[PDB]
Amino acid sequence: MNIFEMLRIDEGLRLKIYKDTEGYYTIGIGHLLTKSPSLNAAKSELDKAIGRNTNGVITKDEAEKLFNQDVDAAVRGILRNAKLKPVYDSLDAVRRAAAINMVFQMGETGVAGFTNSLRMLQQKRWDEAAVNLAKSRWYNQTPNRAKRVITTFRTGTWDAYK
Ligand SMILES: Fc1c(F)c(F)c(I)c(F)c1F
């Protein structure tokens, strides 16, 4: 198991434009295209991302290309953030994957609300952190995924992903 296999499980793989859990146009392995309700706007974002006129369909290779870029971008974003970098650096590699997973899903807009969780994670108060993480819109809207990510933070194992 690793961050790629982990996010592949959590995001799935779809080669045509679909709406994510929040109703936003998405493609591939959870590559958010736009929050705009316009399918045409979404198709434009896709074409821009892939570098060709796609008409809303991509290949597995192209999906994997975007995915690698997205994971890379998520990690790079963590390291460039003053409030995130020290917590990330404090973690072991398994829990770092759990951090990347959350950033991938919600971005730094969504991660901003998790200040108290981050503090408990840096303190290595794993059970307390796990309890705090669940007290969130995130947990309530995507409980099965959140439970997997939280278990990963609680245990520092891949048990929730087999
Ligand atoms: F740096 C970090 C993040 F950006 C993050 F989202 C989470 I959840 C973390 F647990 C973390 F350590």
Curated annotation (Swiss-Prot):
Keywords: Antimicrobial, Bacteriolytic enzyme, Cytolysis, Glycosidase, Host cell lysis by virus, Host cytoplasm, Hydrolase, Viral release from host cell. Substrate binds at L32, F104, S117, N132. The active site is at E11, D20. It holds the Pfam family Phage_lysozyme. CDD domains: T4-like_lys. One of its GO terms (biological process) is viral release from host cell by cytolysis. Changing G30F: Almost complete loss of enzymatic activity. The enzyme is destabilized by 1.5 kcal/mol. Its EC number is 3.2.1.17. Changing D20 to E/Q: Loss of 99% of enzymatic activity. Changing S117V: 50-fold decrease in enzymatic activity. It is an enzyme of class 3 (hydrolase). It comes from the Viruses. Belongs to the glycosyl hydrolase 24 family. This is Endolysin. The gene is E.
